[PDB]
Paper text:
The subject of this study, the JC virus (JCV), is a member of this family and the causative agent of a brain disease termed Progressive Multifocal Leukoencephalopathy (PML), a disease that is often fatal and for which there is no cure. Herein we present the high-resolution crystal structure of the origin binding domain (OBD) from the JCV initiator protein large T-antigen. The T-antigens encoded by polyomaviruses are multi-domain, multifunctional proteins that form hexamers and double hexamers at origins of replication. The topology of the JCV OBD is a five-stranded antiparallel β-sheet sandwiched between two helices on either side.
The JCV OBD (residues 132–261) crystallized in three different forms that were termed form 1, form 2 and form 3. The four structures are very similar; a superposition of the four JCV OBD structures revealed root mean-squared deviations (RMSDs) of less than 0.5 Å. JCV OBD region B3 (residues 216–220) is poorly ordered in crystal forms 1 and 2, but well ordered in form 3. This loop is also poorly ordered in several of the SV40 OBD structures. To better understand how the JCV T-ag OBDs may assemble during oligomerization, we examined the interactions among the OBDs within the three crystal forms. As described in this section, the largest interface between adjacent molecules is the same in all three crystals. To extend these analyses, we examined the interactions among OBDs within crystal forms 2 and 3. Therefore, crystal forms 2 and 3 were superimposed on one OBD from crystal form 1 and the relevant symmetry mates displayed (crystal form 1 is colored as in Fig. 8A, while the other two forms are colored gray). Furthermore, the near perfect superposition indicates that the interfaces are nearly identical.
Numbering used by the authors: 133 to 259
Write the structure that this text describes.
Amino acid sequence: VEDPKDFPVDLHAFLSQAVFSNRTVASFAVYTTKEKAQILYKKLMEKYSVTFISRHGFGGHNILFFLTPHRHRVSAINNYCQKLCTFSFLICKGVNKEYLFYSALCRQPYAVVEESIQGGLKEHDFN
């Protein structure tokens, strides 16, 4: 109805728009509701054994950002997430700039809510 159809525009810079790609990657984002995100935060951590995952607020919606040990098609992460949704929207894309995306999601108009690693994510954990 008035559900979003993509991520907020300030994050497009960070996201891959080719959702049907055969290329397998290791960082992902999910834009959905507080409720759905609260659950996926725990499910994803267990299904993908994420090396890291965080949940961020934006009005009433949430954005999950997570890294995985092994690579996966964006298509696959999405399919898994969508099975938890019926009427709630949910957008899932691949993330290119890991530490920068995570940065933007830690500042206005966004904010961190919960993380799987204290202090969160440090810049030196990347190239």
